[PDB]
Paper text:
On the other hand, two SAVED domains in the structure of AsCap5 are close and make contact with one another. But the two contacting surfaces are not completely closed and a gap between them can be seen. Therefore, the structure of AsCap5 can be best described as in ajar configuration. Importantly, unlike the two-fold symmetry applicable for the entire LlCap5 structure, the Front of the first SAVED domain of AsCap5 faces the Back of the second SAVED domain. Therefore, the two-fold symmetry is only applicable to the HNH homodimer. The HNH domain of AsCap5 (AsCap5-HNH) is significantly more structured near the active site than the one of LlCap5. Specifically, a well-coordinated Mg2+ ion is only observed with AsCap5-HNH, and nine residues of LlCap5-HNH near the active site are disordered. We created a model of AsCap5-HNH in complex with DNA•RNA hybrid, which revealed that part of a loop in AsCap5-HNH has a steric clash with the DNA strand of the modeled DNA•RNA hybrid (colored black). Based on this analysis, we conclude that the configuration of AsCap5 shown in Fig. 3b is also likely to be inactive. 3′,2′-cGAMP might act as a glue, bringing two SAVED domains closer to seal the gap shown in the structure of AsCap5 (right).
Here, we present the biochemical and structural characterization of two CBASS systems, composed of CdnG and Cap5, from Asticcacaulis sp. and Lactococcus lactis. We show that CdnG from Asticcacaulis sp. synthesizes 3′,2′-cGAMP in vitro, and 3′,2′-cGAMP is the biological signaling molecule that activates Cap5 for DNA degradation. Each monomer of Cap5 is composed of the N-terminal HNH domain, the C-terminal SAVED domain, and a short flexible linker connecting these two domains. The structures revealed that both Cap5 form homodimers, resulting from the side-by-side packing of two HNH domains.
Residue numbers in the entry:
A (entry chain A), B (entry chain B): 4 to 371
The structure:
C-alpha cells in the first residue's frame, strides 16, 4: 500500500484535484466515496505487474514512489486504465503530472507579502521618552502585517536651536528630512528587499506632508495614527465612522483650502493671512478633535474625500497659480495629504503653520 | 495527537504553505525539519489548556478538529504562541485560516488551459519605482488566468536624449515598440509558445494606441488598467458602470474626435490647432476623472461605444479622408482604441498629444 506520508505529499502537490479535469477530490475523500481507489491515487506504472503500463522490475520498484503517482477522479482513472491505455503512456502521464504540480505551486505562491518594514519619523528616536517606540510599532502592524525586520528605519526630527516660528527651523528640517530619506530609505528601496512600509510619523504637519510626498511613488505603504486613550499606534475601529464634508466660501482668485479635522479653523485666520480677495474651500470633520482619526476606514475616506476635493478645486478654478493649505490634521492624514498629491495633476501646495507664540498662519513649506 | 487524515486535509487546504508568510513547507516536511512542531501544525485554540488561547473546555474539544488547525513555519508559530499571543486572537487567526484556504482553493481551480503571458509597456521596467511590477501583474491575472511564465515580456518606453515635444522622440519610441514587439512577442506566437496575452501599458497615449494596433489581430488579449486607491492593476467591481456619451458639434470639412474619459476637453483646444472649419465629434464619460475606469465591463462598454461612434463618423462623412483624435483616456481605453480600429472600414487616425508646458495639442502619430 501507499504510505500515508506519500499520500500527504501527493495530495499537497496535486492540490487535491484530478490531474486530468482538475475537479476537487477533497470533499469526496472526506465523504469516504473513494471505495474503488483509496485516496484517488492512480499509479502511472501500475503497482501490479500485469496492470496498465506494468513492468516486472519497475512495478514493485515504483508502487510506493510518489514520482509515479497522480490524483484522478474515478472516471478518469478508468479512462487511463481501461478505455484509453494506449493514449496515456508513461511519458504522457508523467508530463501531465509535472505540469499539473508545477501549475499548482505557481498559483499558490502568488499573494501579497505580509512582511513589513517599519519607518519612524519623529524627534528623539531611540530615547526613553520617544513617542514612537519599536515594541509598540512591532505590535501595531499585526495582524495585517508582521515585522520583516525587528528594527525600524529611523528618520530623525533632528534637534535644533531654532523654534517653530523661525524660517531657519523649516529649512533645516526639510533639507534634513530630504538628506535622511535619500540616505537610509532610497538605497534600501532600490535594493528591493523592502516590499511593504509601515509608517509611524510624529512631526509638525508641514514636515509630515513632505514625508508623504517622499512616499508618494511607493506601492505598499500603510500609515499609522497615534491614538490617544489608550495611547498607541495600532488601528482600532470601535467608533462610528468619521463624517467629513466639503464646502466653500468667498469668490476671490486666491484659492485656499482649510482642513479642519482635529480642530476648527475660522475663515478669519485665512483672510487675515491671505488677501481679502480669496476663495476658501473647506475639508472638515464633524466633531473635529485631535483623537478623531480612529480607524483605517476613517483614513481611507479622508484619502478619497481629499481626492474628490482636489479634482473639484482645479475644475472650478482652471486659472491655477497654487492652492494655499491651512491644516489642523491628525498625523496620519497629514502624511496622506502629501502621499495622494499628484505632482503634475494637482495645484502646487503652499503649506501654512500656526505660529503658536504670537501671530497666526505663516507659509512654511511648499510642494510643486 | 492529530489524526493522519486531518493532517492530509489541512495540508491540502493550506497548499503546504505557512498561513502567515506563505512560504512552502513540504520540502522541510520531507527533510524532517519539523522538529519543534510535527507537520508544522499550529492549534489556534491550543491543545494544551495552559497554552496560548487554551481553554479547559474547548482545548480537548478542538485538539483534533481541522477547523482549529493552521500550517505555520517555526518562526511564525513562535510569533503567534510566544511573541504576539494577544494580537493574534482566535477570531483573527480564524480570519487568516479562512482567507488562506479560500485563496488556495480558488487559484488551484484555474485549469491548465487558462495560462497567460504578461506583457508590459512602460518606462523603467525592472526598477524599484516602476509602476508596473511582475508581482502585481501576476496577482492581477488571477483568478481568470494564471501566469504561464514567471517573467513579464518587457516593451520599453525607451530612454533617449529626445524630448516628447520634438518629432524625433515619437519616431524613436515607435521604432522601438515595433522592434521589441516583433522580436519578443511575434516569434513566440507562430509556434504557440505565447497564446493568451495579459497587457499592462503605461505610456503616452499615442504610443498606447500603437501598442493596441500591434495587438489588433490577436484573438486572446486581456488589457489591464492601473487603478488608484489602492494602487494596482487588478480589475475591480465596486462602482456603478461608467456612463458614456456620444455627441457632435459643427459642420466643417475637417473631422475631429475628442475622447474625454479621464478629463474634459473643451472645443477651443481642437479649434485651432485645427481651424474653425471643423466637425468635432466627442466621446465623453460623465464625471471624467483619472480613476474612472474601474471595471472590465467599463472597458468593454468603451469598446462597443467607440466602435459604434467610429461607424457613425464614417457614415456621416463619406468624403472624409481622415479623423483627428484628441484623447484624454485611461491607459486601458487607449490600448483598446488601437485594438478595435479597422483598416478595412475605419478612417485613418491622426493622434494628437498635449504638449506639456508649451501648451496646445500637436500631431504626434497616425494609424493607416
Ligand atoms: Mg491504475
Ligand atoms: Mg501551538
Ligand atoms: Zn477527472
Ligand atoms: Zn511563515
Amino acid at each position: 500500500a501507499v504510505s500515508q506520508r506519500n499520500k500527504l505529499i501527493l495530495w499537497t502537490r496535486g492540490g487535491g484535484r484530478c490531474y486530468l479535469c482538475n475537479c476537487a477530490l477533497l470533499g469526496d475523500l472526506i465523504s469516504g466515496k473513494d471505495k474503488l481507489n483509496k485516496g484517488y491515487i492512480a499509479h502511472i506504472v501500475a503497482a501490479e505487474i500485469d496492470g496498465p503500463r506494468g513492468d516486472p522490475i519497475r512495478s514493485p520498484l515504483l508502487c510506493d514512489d510518489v514520482e509515479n503517482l497522480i490524483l484522478l477522479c474515478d472516471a478518469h482513472h478508468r479512462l487511463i486504465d481501461v478505455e484509453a491505455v494506449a493514449e496515456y503512456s508513461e511519458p504522457r502521464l508523467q508530463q501531465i503530472k509535472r505540469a499539473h504540480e508545477a501549475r499548482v505551486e505557481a498559483v499558490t505562491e502568488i499573494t501579497a507579502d505580509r512582511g513589513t518594514h517599519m519607518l519612524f519619523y519623529s524627534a528623539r528616536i531611540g530615547e526613553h521618552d520617544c513617542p514612537i517606540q519599536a515594541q509598540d510599532a512591532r505590535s501595531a502592524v499585526l495582524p495585517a502585517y508582521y515585522p520583516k525586520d525587528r528594527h525600524p528605519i529611523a528618520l530623525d526630527v533632528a534637534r535644533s536651536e531654532y523654534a517653530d516660528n523661525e524660517a531657519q527651523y523649516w529649512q533645516f528640517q526639510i533639507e534634513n528630512l530630504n538628506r535622511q530619506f535619500e540616505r537610509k530609505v532610497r538605497p534600501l528601496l532600490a535594493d528591493g528587499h523592502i516590499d511593504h512600509l509601515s509608517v509611524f510619523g510624529l512631526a509638525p504637519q508641514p514636515l509630515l506632508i513632505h514625508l508623504g510626498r517622499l512616499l508618494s511613488d511607493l506601492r505598499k505603504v500603510r500609515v499609522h495614527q497615534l491614538h490617544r486613550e489608550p495611547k498607541g499606534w495600532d488601528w482600532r475601529n470601535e467608533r462610528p465612522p468619521v463624517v467629513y464634508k466639503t464646502d466653500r466660501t468667498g469668490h476671490g482668485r486666491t484659492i485656499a483650502l482649510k482642513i479642519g479635522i482635529s480642530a476648527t479653523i475660522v475663515d478669519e485666520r485665512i483672510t487675515r493671512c491671505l488677501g481679502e480677495d480669496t476663495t476658501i474651500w473647506s475639508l472638515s470633520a464633524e466633531g473635529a478633535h485631535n483623537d478623531i482619526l480612529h480607524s483605517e476606514g476613517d483614513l481611507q475616506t479622508f484619502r478619497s474625500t481629499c481626492r474628490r476635493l482636489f479634482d473639484a478645486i482645479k475644475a472650478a478654478h482652471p486659472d491655477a497659480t497654487d492652492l494655499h493649505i491651512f491644516p489642523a490634521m491628525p498625523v496620519s492624514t497629514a502624511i496622506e495629504l502629501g502621499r495622494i498629491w499628484m505632482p503634475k495633476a494637482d495645484l502646487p501646495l503652499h503649506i501654512y503653520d500656526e505660529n503658536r507664540t504670537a501671530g497666526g498662519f505663516f507659509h512654511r513649506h511648499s510642494l510643486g
